[PDB]
Design a protein around this ligand. Sequence first.
Ligand code: NAD
Ligand code: NAD
Lengths: 255, 255, 255, 255
Amino acid sequence: NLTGKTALVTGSTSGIGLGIAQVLAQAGATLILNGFGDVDAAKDAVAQYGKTPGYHGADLSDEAQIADMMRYAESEFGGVDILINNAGIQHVSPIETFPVDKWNAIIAINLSSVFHTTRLALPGMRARNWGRIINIASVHGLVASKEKSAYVAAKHGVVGLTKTIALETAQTEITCNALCPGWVLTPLVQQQIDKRIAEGAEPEAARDALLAEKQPSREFVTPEQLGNLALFLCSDGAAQVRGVAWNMDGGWVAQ
Amino acid sequence: NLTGKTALVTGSTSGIGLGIAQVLAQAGATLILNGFGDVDAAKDAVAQYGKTPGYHGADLSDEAQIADMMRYAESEFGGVDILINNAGIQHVSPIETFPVDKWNAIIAINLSSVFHTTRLALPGMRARNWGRIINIASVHGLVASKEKSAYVAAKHGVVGLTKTIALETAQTEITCNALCPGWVLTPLVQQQIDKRIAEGAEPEAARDALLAEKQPSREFVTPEQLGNLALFLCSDGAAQVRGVAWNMDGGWVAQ
Amino acid sequence: NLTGKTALVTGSTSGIGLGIAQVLAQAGATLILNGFGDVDAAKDAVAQYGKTPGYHGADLSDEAQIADMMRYAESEFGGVDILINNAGIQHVSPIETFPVDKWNAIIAINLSSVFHTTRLALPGMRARNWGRIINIASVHGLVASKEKSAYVAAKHGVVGLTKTIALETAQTEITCNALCPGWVLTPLVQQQIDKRIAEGAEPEAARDALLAEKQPSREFVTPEQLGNLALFLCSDGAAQVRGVAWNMDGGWVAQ
Amino acid sequence: NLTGKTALVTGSTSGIGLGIAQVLAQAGATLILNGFGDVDAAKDAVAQYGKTPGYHGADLSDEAQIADMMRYAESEFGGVDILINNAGIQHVSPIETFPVDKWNAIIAINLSSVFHTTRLALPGMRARNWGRIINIASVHGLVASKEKSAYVAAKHGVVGLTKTIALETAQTEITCNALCPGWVLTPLVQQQIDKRIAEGAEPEAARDALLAEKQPSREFVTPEQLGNLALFLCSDGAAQVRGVAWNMDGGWVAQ
Ligand SMILES: NC(=O)c1ccc[n+]([C@@H]2O[C@H](COP(=O)([O-])OP(=O)(O)OC[C@H]3O[C@@H](n4cnc5c(N)ncnc54)[C@H](O)[C@@H]3O)[C@@H](O)[C@H]2O)c1
Ligand SMILES: NC(=O)c1ccc[n+]([C@@H]2O[C@H](COP(=O)([O-])OP(=O)(O)OC[C@H]3O[C@@H](n4cnc5c(N)ncnc54)[C@H](O)[C@@H]3O)[C@@H](O)[C@H]2O)c1
């Protein structure tokens, strides 16, 4: 189904990216993992679904390490066919006391890394005339929240970047699209929940408290749901899906 | 997959609607077709892939006929689990010389029919706590083209309507979403192309004729691709996709 | 400034329409008022700012009365130069128990009247090659709220209708735009404010009780603020403002 | 009107920024210009309408220079009341061969400079509980065009950033909004028009040529028209306009 396709999922040693990675693995694709933390756990969790994945530990905030990483992809796997730009970081702060370092890193990782990977994978994709570039944005690429200025900017930046590359590839068999999830039950978010429960909150009170304001369904998006959406974007049934910001968000943007 | 679930697709005797019906049918779904023309050919086109579909010939511009269709879906098939609002007529004209009956018929069929089917299907869906409401809007639900004032107003309307319904059902296992296609290769459009080709035009040349202005990829969207996106919305993968307006449009809205 | 221009504002006997009228009259415009209730109070509240206004009691839910009103505008003032479609009505209800009557009325008044007025004033505007069509929609022409299906549909529809008419007049000195306010302090909203104060709530506690969820500024838009925006749209600095849905909403849609 | 208020306009030694500076000056504002080129001409061009403006030559891609500009504003004029982020640069290129240094420059100037200038002005504004922040994005903050990946990403970014700042200030008398113009008749545009006219093109034909694809009115936006929209945003009539992205574009985004 995706057999003979190489998928690069950026920041896939945890959360959403690992979810998406496992799903593509299940579908038959060769995966290259990226990101820090528990790395052989990440490799193995994907390995259980087919081919053992490759790995490059590029720090995405560094243009040099990305170039290195892409050559590795090309030298060892013959070039990326499916590029999932997923990695990203957060910093919540009022703007007047938002750290400049944090601004530069959030831009570098959440916006500029998508430019750099897409830059380096596209030539190979054009030669083979086939490709999938999927950028994991956020609801915050479509709307904003207070105290997330660098993140909302970068993610908005991602959405615009995506429509551009889509138009640049419009007349080829290469598509470029963005997913915009709302709250996803990742390691980070389950932490916030379990330690509301620890305060005395009932589970389905800890959850919807954290989700009431922004997400009408009062339910989380799962990494698996996103992985299934990315897989549909990789399918032939998505041949004319181009330049889109598809939200999976329990009703967030509809509101 | 969709075995034991009843899907009603309005305007499914031809084109986009018929394509979506076949795709749900092969996925196990029990269908009810709607529309005019060669019904037995529409029936046979579906029964080829799955169960012999039901049929009801309601004029969608008549509120009472729609109610009979829902009374039919309830009696004979146990109610609607998957409601696909699809049918949608057209009249190109400057607003100044735009016939009032034409405005009224377009609003009634392309907008008011969506209100009627969804309000009569939703109680059954709520009792079972499961349902999918999928409205086929268009790119013209998100942007405008000149001389399509009634059509754009209706489709915009359908998008708004979809968002509202999703919010009223956010905390259930019932979702409401809109799909917004660009140019779709219907038989209606194959005939535009053939007639051009019959006058000396190269095939690709006739294709670029129709698509160069509004659709960057210059490739049509197919009913099948739309069926596959509709089927994904029906999956468990789409539990938290709510009140969206997803463009499948060769890059149309991206400009 | 606007002296020598005729402005027709629908539903201008109360609230938002009356405010816009008073501002336009102040700017020199001849006004034609429309709407029900305390008519003389409205006529005089306008005439205090200069020229004493005209009036027509067309029920905008009926197509033929709008034809009467418009032909009265032409046969008594020599046409409309500035058409403010403001009239609107509301019904809050879950969809499955939404009255069909209210649905039809809300569509007729909030959406279809804009079609009927615009199609009748436009020929005259085209002859004089100058015109302002300004449609008061809502934030609900852009996002949705539960239990307001007919209203959100109509207003979304209005936004789409505006975009098309703007494209149709693109190359003339006629512009067509929409305004999308959030909560505005009109007599119905103030009556809800006093409702809570009498309940025991302190004033600035009753307002944000009404505005917290949807309007981040926790401050009302005023009919005067809207009238000043509409006036700017009538100016020549707004020559190239076309197809627009400008929100004035205290941060509603940014969220 | 604006008497007593200090306005800083980045990139105001020419074009859009100079047009906006002139409109604010004649409204009574004290201006601080910024940018390169013929500075004394720019000062003179503003002083003819109102007070002799200040100037600061900060490189907007350099964060420390920006902070010196703001320290200059605090020391010489008492702080910024009206901050207008206007300065923006362009590089047209397919992403594959898009120079890195150009990507970094465009992001820094068109996006990060908005963050730095706004984070430094906001304390002053908050203390006085009054302020306007107006960011000149472009239609490319809302849609994409081919081969402007850095510019579209940056401008989209500005739009997101604008929304989130609006929200951090929603309950103050400080507003933050984005203006998104289409093609503006700047000197560069007028001089590429003269180029075509010098080669035999009729005037309208040359303008038609430049505007045909993307701007339906086929008429340019002017710096003065933009200045007057900015000035309206600075009025009390705009108190509840927050985190908007208002297009003034001859119908570009309406398509
Ligand atoms: N968690 C949510 O609710 C949510 C919602 C919407 C969008 N998103 C987006 O999905 C993406 C993944 O977020 P997540 O929730 O799965 O978090 P996560 O921490 O679980 O995983 C993020 C990945 O990014 C990696 N990473 C961080 N910095 C890196 C760097 N400099 N170089 C290389 N890798 C780096 C991490 O190693 C990790 O593998 C993000 O872009 C996020 O904005 C998340
Ligand atoms: N009040 C708000 O907070 C708010 C917010 C956003 C948008 N709007 C919209 O502004 C417009 C007016 O709102 P409002 O608050 O001033 O209401 P309002 O009740 O104070 O008065 C509006 C006008 O509508 C007239 N009207 C109603 N039905 C009519 C009919 N069949 N024929 C002729 N006139 C009719 C009324 O006579 C009145 O003059 C509407 O379109 C509304 O949706 C209001």
